Design an enzyme around this catalytic site. Structure first.
Site, PDB file in Angstrom:
ATOM      1  N   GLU D  60       0.767  -1.187  -0.054  1.00  0.00           N
ATOM      2  CA  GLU D  60      -0.030  -0.077   0.077  1.00  0.00           C
ATOM      3  C   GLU D  60       0.934   1.129  -0.115  1.00  0.00           C
ATOM      4  OE1 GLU D  60      -2.950   0.660   3.544  1.00  0.00           O
ATOM      5  OE2 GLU D  60      -2.379   2.650   3.062  1.00  0.00           O
ATOM      6  N   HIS D  61       1.903   1.054   0.627  1.00  0.00           N
ATOM      7  CA  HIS D  61       2.838   2.349   0.771  1.00  0.00           C
ATOM      8  C   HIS D  61       3.460   2.589  -0.449  1.00  0.00           C
ATOM      9  CE1 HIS D  61       2.755   3.877   4.949  1.00  0.00           C
ATOM     10  NE2 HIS D  61       2.543   2.713   5.426  1.00  0.00           N
ATOM     11  N   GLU D 137       5.223   5.166  11.536  1.00  0.00           N
ATOM     12  CA  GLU D 137       3.592   5.146  11.586  1.00  0.00           C
ATOM     13  C   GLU D 137       3.325   4.204  12.450  1.00  0.00           C
ATOM     14  OE1 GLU D 137       2.052   4.701   7.734  1.00  0.00           O
ATOM     15  OE2 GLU D 137       2.706   6.445   6.937  1.00  0.00           O
TER      16      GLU D 137
END
Ligand SMILES: CCCCCCCCCCCCCCCCCC(=O)OC[C@H](COP(=O)([O-])OCC(O)COP(=O)([O-])OC[C@@H](COC(=O)CCCCCCCCCCCCCCCCC)OC(=O)CCCCCCCCCCCCCCCCC)OC(=O)CCCCCCCCCCCCCCCCC
Ligand SMILES: CCCCCCCCCCCCCCCCCC(=O)OC[C@H](COP(=O)([O-])OCC(O)COP(=O)([O-])OC[C@@H](COC(=O)CCCCCCCCCCCCCCCCC)OC(=O)CCCCCCCCCCCCCCCCC)OC(=O)CCCCCCCCCCCCCCCCC
Ligand SMILES: CCCCCCCCCCCCCCCCC[C@@H](O)O[C@H](CO[C@H](O)CCCCCCCCCCCCCCC)COP(=O)(O)OCC[N+](C)(C)C
Ligand SMILES: CCCCCCCCCCCCCCCCCC(=O)OC[C@H](COP(=O)(O)OCCN)OC(=O)CCCCCCCCCCCCCCCCC
Ligand SMILES: CCCCCCCCCCCCCCCCCC(=O)OC[C@H](COP(=O)(O)OCCN)OC(=O)CCCCCCCCCCCCCCCCC
Lengths: 106, 62, 52, 446, 32, 422
Positions: D60-61, D137
């Protein structure tokens, strides 16, 4: 409406009022009512001045009862000067309770 | 491992405590009857011929 | 009393009726068992044997 | 003029159409001048192992960092010159990439979308940058308390199962991944027919089908060596996890019992029950002895700050429970009231409460669908969950079947005398022991 | 970092019917 | 389905504007928009509006507090009170069949409020809870300081009650504000699922209430002061605003295009905004986490254009200098054509995407009806937005550079500049 019966009703009510001794202590009628939760909330809604007056008159009555004394004749509460200050608040509280109970059953 | 048997017992008589109590009461009633009868029989066996119950026949109506 | 009426208090009683019957049955059997009440017990297929 | 069930019949329906490779294309047309086009994939952390726990999150990143045709910043320059919005999200059972744009740009959007799901460049320098970003994160997520207790609940309720581990994965795992595991994960999972294209708004199904064939038609559908990633059921465990830290302001309990899979009728009735309990907060207006029973009691001694009821559904299994915050000194009282409410629903359920629950459910269903993006999400999630899109009329029909007796039986089936799963992160010295919690799931009076 | 937490194995304490991490527990709960 | 309907406008002799639309959605929505706001308070009464919007659930002469909540809760509907310095908006949502019930409450709450003094006193402590939640996010405190730093009288009024007034708001002040600001001419009513003719007669009831015009405010004057805070947080916030154009003017459009040229809003998630000029200018200034974008707040009396920069305490000065230097280059006339088109596309997509949601659409219609009373379709917005020329943007940039600036900055402030040296 009935005049003689109404005047008789007023006369007997005044007689009963004088028979009750709370006027002898400067107490108003609304001070003697039993303090249930409804009355407790009603008192909580009073303005400061009426609340302060109510507390002081109760103290004076308790103090007089302490020594088995009686307030002078001239200072007794009169049947026509009384103000039912607590009636509107107590009525509103009771009506609110009825509405809650009526909703709660259906 | 009668898992089905335990499953049936639970689903019918243990899920609600009211039924749980009722089964307990009937069970103890039956259990006491069986327990008492079995225990007394064992006691009589161990002491055969000595208890008055075993010799009363020689005098009763005699 | 008047507040206790209403469509729902009737419903609440209906739901709890089965539980009330079971609890009442539990008490009745318990009383009979505790007291060894021969009157009812004499009509029990196996327990009756206890009575001589 | 129109009745409720009468207005339900004016909602346009969704047109489905398969491609040769097995890709499903769905669309709901309207007169709006905008659209939302996205791809939903039935891939999540549930399909991963310890060696590749964080692969889904990591990809996703890198999804929009560049591709073979549009290297580097070319991808975002095109997206932003169009005025569109590119977004993505992940889960333990689904992944999605969707774009909000104008109908006038439907063609290009699909092209880019296809390019992002087939030609994802995985430059190594980018991998190093994402390593630190994910590491930071993860630190932020630690600050969030709700995430922490919801991950704990999964960890304890699915012990030893692929559903226990989190989407992000262990920190130790994200620092050892390579460009070979990511490619293996991508090749092994991202392919038709698992993909589902969806486009709600002012889009025509005919146009959506020709464009998909042009771009999405090239996706393979054959596994190498027939190494098919088969799914397996998940076991549920009744256990508790307690992470004590008295420096934190409030206790943060979370409880839940096992619940049906997404594809059982009973879930609908359970939703109604969750509406009876309701949610509470400190900012809500009024409600003091004026709202639902759990919230009315929630302000008599000022017990809770905010509680919410959830119902998480997965294939063949799910979680049903209630999450609440509370002060250090009032932990046990809040739990006591909550358990009483559940038991009351199991035994004494009036129709008046049920009618309120049904009305709340109708409002949530209709109001949630407002907007294009929620509609597209529903299409994608339903096609990957049920295989169809339940229309509103059907939802209303099923809800109308709900009755007080029905709720009693279903709640008794899942709530009564069942072993719960508990998670608590905060000052939790007052939290009652499991035995006391487990003994509060039934009534000695019943 | 909280994602690094995982429950230790309890296999030596679990009952027989729940010893497999793939079979559902709902089919034995009522029996147990 | 039937043909796409249109919205009907009408203006009663009282001055009230009534607008309705007939869609076929199964959920109905009604809204009441009032020109009352925080800018209409004076120094004598302050925090009145902040308490007023919390009273929506209180008892009325025609309906009890118990009845309102229970009735709305049973139907499954909602009632909310959006607020801003210029306007206050009551809104209610429910199903098609229950409209007639909910409107009875909505009308009542705004026509015959009965501010029981004991109820008000009991509601007072809630003010602290609401205020604290809002200030949890530092951005709220920075702006409320920013408005208090750039305006002297009118718009400087905070949206939240000052601390010292929390326990001293009275029901008389609530009553006085209502009479003088809930006038019919100041109000507008909007409906989405309801039919227009029934809307006329439901609204006929309050035609015996309010009336005429209310108490006018004062034109907001500009000062240009600074308000520093010096809190212990590591991440310093700031603000750099200057006088702008007035809401609903041709110049206001140029400022809207200007901010979007400067990367006002992020588009792609987990991605650097390369097209944004400000992020590029800052990227080569700091190598630690930072956030920057442009600010635009247009009001009826005046507007404010500026910049907001989250950055590390040590790098605050460099971040601000880079952002300010970037604006100077734009003002010097260095502006490419492609950026203009890209920014315009961002604007139109944002506008249509925001109005797409029914709730926002009802909000936009109400806001427009109050000032003008004549809805302006989105296509007309597009023609207006496409008329912007480059010279207009250069003039807008030059005005911002030459104008006096107001700055509010919370954070450590060890290295943050001051005005007159920026
Ligand atoms: C509860 C009240 C129980 C009182 C009656 C129990 C005995 C039953 C009885 O007497 O005959 C009546 C009748 C016939 O029963 P039965 O089994 O044929 O008679 C057995 C005799 O007890 C046989 O009497 P017995 O002389 O042959 O042998 C002595 C006997 C007699 O001793 C007693 O009965 C003692 C009574 C004390 C009861 C009060 C205790 C609490 C105060 O004592 C015992 O052996 C123990 C049984 C007595 C009850 C003990 C358990 C009580 C708990 O029994 C009943 O109706 C039971 C009454 C319970 C229902 C309440 C009805 C009220 C309406
Ligand atoms: C014949 C069958 C009669 C069945 C009558 C059922 C009456 C149910 C009832 O109204 O209260 C529930 C009852 C508590 O009765 P209560 O204290 O008078 O409360 C009256 C109101 O219901 C207010 O209830 P609540 O607000 O107290 O909450 C219900 C329940 C909630 O449960 C709890 O929180 C108690 C947790 C610890 C229980 C064990 C205590 C130590 C033993 O409360 C309790 O269980 C209190 C138990 C205190 C026992 C006294 C201290 C130990 C000696 O608790 C139950 O769950 C049912 C127990 C029924 C036992 C039947 C045994 C038959 C043999
Ligand atoms: C009078 C003198 C008495 C002296 C007693 C001396 C005792 C010495 C030995 C001590 C033994 C201690 C243990 C005894 C009980 C062990 C089991 C107990 O601890 O469990 C609890 C026992 O709890 C009770 O069983 C609850 C039901 C109540 C049953 C009451 C039966 C009463 C029978 C006798 C009635 C007599 C009536 C007489 C009327 C005249 C909780 O069980 P639990 O498994 O967690 O309940 C789950 C409920 N489900 C099944 C519905 C889900
Ligand atoms: C000997 C005394 C100790 C053993 C018997 C009492 C006991 O076991 O206490 C627990 C029992 C059941 O109550 P419990 O499940 O713990 O919680 C309340 C229900 N939610 O509570 C009971 O008292 C059960 C027996 C009375 C009914
Ligand atoms: C006289 C009383 C004797 C009590 C002890 C009985 C033997 C030991 C029971 C035990 O260890 O508990 C585990 C429990 C019961 O054993 P279970 O798995 O059902 O079957 C075993 C077949 N060898 O395992 C279970 O599955 C029961 C679940 C409760």
């Amino acid at each position: 409406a009935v005049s003689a019966s109404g005047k008789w009703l007023d006369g007997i009510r005044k007689w009963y009022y004088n028979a009750a001794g709370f006027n002898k202590l400067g107490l108003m009628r609304d001070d003697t009512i039993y303090e249930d939760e409804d009355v407790k909330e009603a008192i909580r809604r009073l303005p400061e001045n009426l609340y302060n007056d109510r507390m002081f008159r109760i103290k004076r009555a308790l103090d007089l009862n302490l020594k088995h004394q009686i307030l002078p004749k001239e200072q007794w509460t009169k049947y026509e000067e009384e103000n039912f200050y607590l009636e509107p608040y107590l009525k509103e509280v009771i009506r609110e309770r009825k509405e809650r109970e009526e909703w709660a059953k259906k | 491992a009668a898992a089905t048997l335990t499953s049936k017992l639970y689903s019918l008589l243990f899920r609600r405590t009211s039924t749980f109590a009722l089964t307990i009461i009937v069970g103890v009633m039956f259990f006491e009857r069986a327990f008492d009868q079995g225990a007394d029989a064992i006691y009589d066996h161990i002491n055969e011929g000595k208890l008055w119950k075993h010799i009363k026949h020689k005098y009763e109506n005699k | 009393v008047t507040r206790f009426l209403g469509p729902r208090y009737r419903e609440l009683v209906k739901n709890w009726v089965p539980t009330a019957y079971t609890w009442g049955a539990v008490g009745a059997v318990g009383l009979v068992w505790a007291t060894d009440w021969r009157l009812i017990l004499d009509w029990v297929p196996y327990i009756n044997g206890k009575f001589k | 003029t129109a009745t409720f069930a009468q207005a339900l019949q004016f909602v346009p329906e969704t047109q489905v159409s398969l491609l040769d490779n097995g890709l499903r294309v769905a669309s709901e047309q309207s007169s709006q001048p905008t659209c939302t086009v996205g791809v939903w994939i039935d891939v999540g952390s549930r399909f991963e192992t310890e060696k590749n726990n964080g692969a889904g999150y990591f990809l996703e990143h890198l999804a929009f960092k560049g591709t073979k045709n549009r290297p580097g910043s070319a991808l975002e320059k095109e997206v932003e010159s169009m005025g569109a919005h590119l977004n993505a999200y992940s889960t333990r059972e689904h992944t999605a990439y969707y774009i909000k744009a104008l109908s006038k740009d439907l063609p290009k959007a699909v092209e880019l979308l296809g390019d992002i799901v087939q030609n994802c460049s995985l430059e190594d320098s980018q991998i190093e940058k994402e390593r630190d970003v994910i590491l930071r994160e993860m630190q932020e997520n630690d600050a969030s308390m709700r995430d922490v207790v919801f991950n704990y609940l999964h960890a304890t309720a699915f012990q030893g199962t692929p559903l226990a581990q989190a989407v992000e994965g262990p920190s130790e795992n994200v620092r050892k991944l390579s460009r070979a595991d990511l490619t293996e994960y991508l090749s092994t999972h991202y392919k038709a027919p698992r993909m589902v294209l969806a486009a709600a708004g002012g889009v025509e199904h005919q146009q959506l089908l020709d464009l998909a064939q042009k771009h999405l038609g090239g996706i393979p559908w054959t596994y190498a060596e027939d190494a098919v990633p088969t799914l397996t059921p998940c076991r549920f465990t009744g256990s508790e996890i307690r992470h004590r830290d008295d420096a934190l302001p409030f206790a943060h309990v979370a409880i839940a019992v096992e619940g049906p899979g997404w594809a059982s009728p009973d879930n609908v009735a359970l939703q109604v029950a969750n509406a009876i309990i309701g949610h509470y907060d400190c900012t809500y207006g009024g409600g003091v002895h004026l709202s639902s029973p759990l919230a009315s009691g929630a302000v008599a001694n000022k017990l809770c700050q905010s509680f919410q009821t959830f119902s998480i559904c997965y294939a063949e299994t799910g979680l049903l429970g209630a999450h609440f915050v509370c002060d250090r000194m009032k932990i046990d009282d809040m739990m006591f009231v909550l358990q009483g409410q559940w038991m009351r629903l199991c035994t004494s359920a009036t129709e008046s409460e049920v009618a309120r629950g049904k009305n709340i459910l109708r409002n949530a269903l209709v109001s949630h669908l407002d907007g294009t993006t929620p509609v597209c999400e529903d299409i994608g999630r339903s096609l990957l969950t049920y295989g169809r899109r339940i229309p509103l009329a059907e939802w209303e029909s099923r809800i109308a079947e709900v009755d007080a007796s029905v709720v009693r039986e279903i709640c008794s089936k899942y709530i009564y005398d069942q072993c719960p799963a508990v998670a608590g992160y905060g000052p939790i010295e007052q939290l009652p022991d499991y035995n006391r919690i487990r003994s509060g799931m039934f009534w000695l009076r019943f | 970092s909280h994602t690094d937490i995982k429950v230790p194995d309890f296999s030596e304490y679990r009952r027989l019917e729940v010893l497999d991490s793939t079979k559902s527990s709902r089919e034995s709960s009522e029996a147990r | 389905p039937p043909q796409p309907q249109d919205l009907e406008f009408t203006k009663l002799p009282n001055g009230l504007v009534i607008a309705s639309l007939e869609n076929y959605s199964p959920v109905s929505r009604i809204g009441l928009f009032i020109k009352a706001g925080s800018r209409y308070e004076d120094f004598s009464n302050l925090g009145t509006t902040h308490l007023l919007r919390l009273t929506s659930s209180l008892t009325t002469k025609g309906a009890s507090s118990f009845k309102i909540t229970r009735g709305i809760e049973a139907v499954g509907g909602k009632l909310s009170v959006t607020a801003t310095r210029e306007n206050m908006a009551y809104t209610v949502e429910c199903l098609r069949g229950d409209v007639d019930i909910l409107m009875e409450f909505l009308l009542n709450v705004t026509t015959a409020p009965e501010f029981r003094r004991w109820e008000v006193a009991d509601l007072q402590p809630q003010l602290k809870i609401d205020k604290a939640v809002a200030f949890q996010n530092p951005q709220t405190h920075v702006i409320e300081n920013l408005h208090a730093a750039a305006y002297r009288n009118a718009l400087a009024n905070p949206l939240y009650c000052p601390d010292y007034r929390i326990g001293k708001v009275t029901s008389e002040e609530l009553h006085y504000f209502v009479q003088n600001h809930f006038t019919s001419a100041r109000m507008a009513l909007i409906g989405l699922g309801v039919s227009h003719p029934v809307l006329k007669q439901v609204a006929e009831q309050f035609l015996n209430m309010r009336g005429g015009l209310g108490l006018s405010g004062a034109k907001a004057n500009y000062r240009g002061g600074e308000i520093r805070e010096q809190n212990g947080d590591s991440l310093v916030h700031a603000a750099f605003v200057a006088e702008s154009a007035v809401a609903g003017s041709a110049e206001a459009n140029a400022f809207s295009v200007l901010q979007h040229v400067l990367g006002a809003g992020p588009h792609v998630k987990r991605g650097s905004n390369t097209t944004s000029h400000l992020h590029q200018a800052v990227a080569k200034a700091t190598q630690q986490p930072f956030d920057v974008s442009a600010f635009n707040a247009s009001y009826s009396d005046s507007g404010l254009f500026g910049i907001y920069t989250i950055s590390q305490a040590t790098a605050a000065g460099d971040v601000i200098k880079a952002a300010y230097n970037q604006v100077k280059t734009i003002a010097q006339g260095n502006l490419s054509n492609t950026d203009v088109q890209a920014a315009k596309n961002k604007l139109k997509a944002g506008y249509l995407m925001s109005v797409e949601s029914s709730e926002c659409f009802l909000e936009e219609v109400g806001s427009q009806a109050l000032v003008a009373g004549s809805y302006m379709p989105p296509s007309t917005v597009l023609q207006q937005i496409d008329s912007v020329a480059n010279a207009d943007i250069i003039n807008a940039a030059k005005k911002f550079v030459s104008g006096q600036k107001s700055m509010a900055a919370s954070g450590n402030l060890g290295h943050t500049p001051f005005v007159d040296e920026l």
